[PDB]
């Protein structure tokens, strides 16, 4: 049974639901619960407990209880005083996000849905990866309200649908990274296709190689058009940043930079 009191629903992940709750054993503090059924790292939202709800004839209600940081990088970036988020801090946050995302790869884990709304920024700007499945489904340009379930951080791979590898996250870290400076998403897709294009519009159509044969939308459909300069949308981004950014925001997953290595890149000098 749970001591943690479900204070509110906050998302429905595949495995089940996730609410906000107050862990009554501690200060009535806030804690994320993920109620499951069946049949550490500093930058990762900790798992306070696994409460077993019901052992049965094959099926077991559990209730994982994860730590909670009440503020996403989204409200973080939304919040900062007008010039923007300070530069020192990005390198750090950015740095943290990586070290964390790295820690997951190191143990077979692929986050896949690594949107800012899953990145948590603590009171002390200490970052923690987490997933809520909540789905903050969007509407477009004021008078052009097109719906979408925010798939802006989706990798081209997963977009075209031909994988969901370790490097899928890394593409996201890049989107998020660009966004740090940004405080406006780099690629706001509506459909899975729109997004696939947008990325290319910025990055540019890779040669028929990085882009597979079988996979959904054919390379040629998104006609070579463009090779837009990063600086055009990630202003005031220093050299090594412009660097590591593209290294994460690269089309071919195997070619795209790794988490582990990303930590080592010059940028975090």
């Amino acid at each position: 049974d749970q001591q943690y009191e479900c204070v509110a629903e906050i998302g429905e992940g595949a495995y089940g639901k996730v609410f906000k709750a107050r862990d009554l054993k501690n200060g009535g503090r806030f804690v994320a619960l993920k109620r499951v059924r069946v049949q550490e790292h500093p930058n990762v939202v900790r798992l306070f407990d696994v409460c077993t709800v019901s052992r049965t004839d094959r099926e077991t209600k559990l209730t994982l209880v994860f730590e909670h940081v009440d503020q996403d990088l989204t409200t973080y970036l939304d919040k900062v005083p007008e010039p923007g988020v300070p530069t020192e801090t990005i390198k750090d946050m950015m740095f943290q996000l990586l070290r964390g995302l790295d820690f997951l790869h190191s143990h077979r884990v692929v986050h896949r849905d690594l949107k800012p709304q899953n990145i948590l920024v603590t009171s002390s700007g200490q970052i923690k990866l987490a997933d809520f499945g909540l789905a903050r489904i969007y509407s477009f340009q004021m008078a052009l309200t097109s719906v979408v379930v925010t798939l802006w951080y989706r990798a081209p791979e997963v977009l075209l649908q031909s994988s969901y590898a370790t490097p899928v996250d890394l593409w996201s870290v890049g989107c998020i990274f660009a966004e740090m400076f940004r405080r406006k998403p780099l690629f706001r897709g509506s459909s899975d296709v729109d997004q696939l294009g947008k990325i290319l519009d910025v990055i540019g159509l890779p040669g028929e190689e990085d882009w597979p044969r079988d996979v959904a939308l054919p390379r040629q459909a998104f006609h070579s058009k463009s090779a837009q300069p990063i600086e055009k949308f990630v202003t005031d981004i220093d050299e090594l940043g412009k660097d590591l950014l593209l290294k994460c925001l690269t089309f071919n997953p195997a070619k795209r930079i790794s988490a582990y290595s990303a930590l080592s890149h010059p940028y975090f000098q």
Partner: protein, 125 residues
């Protein structure tokens, strides 16, 4: 029937826009959330824009959390979001209330090491 449950998860998910919309779409800024706890109680402290949104929108800032008895200004204080605290403060919530364990938001903030909030509260009180 609820509707002001959508509003809770909104505030909770720190969905400024949906909170607004939800609100300016005829949603009750004071309702229990089927889990009995109104938003601005369940909001994402740290989503000042959201606390501020609800507050200055017909939102009673003073509410004891059924079991916990904790209040927003408390939470704001424990997570370190001076932002939400202050907005909550100017709004009306009294920055010297106690929870089930008998604690001033101050005590929380002081405890977790939230110097800043510790200041905004170890003053103005």
């Amino acid at each position: 029937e609820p509707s002001a449950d959508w509003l809770a998860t909104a505030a909770a998910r720190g969905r400024v826009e949906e909170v607004r919309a939800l609100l300016e779409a005829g949603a009750n800024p004071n309702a229990p959330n089927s889990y009995g706890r109104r938003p601005i109680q369940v909001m994402m402290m740290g989503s000042a824009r959201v606390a501020e949104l609800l507050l200055l929108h017909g939102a009673e800032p003073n509410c004891a959390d059924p079991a916990t008895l904790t209040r927003p200004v408390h939470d704001a204080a424990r997570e370190g979001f001076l932002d939400t605290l202050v907005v909550l403060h100017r709004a009306g919530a009294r920055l010297d209330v106690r929870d089930a364990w008998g604690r001033l938001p101050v005590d929380l903030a002081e405890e977790l090491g939230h110097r800043d909030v510790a200041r905004y509260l170890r003053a103005a009180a």
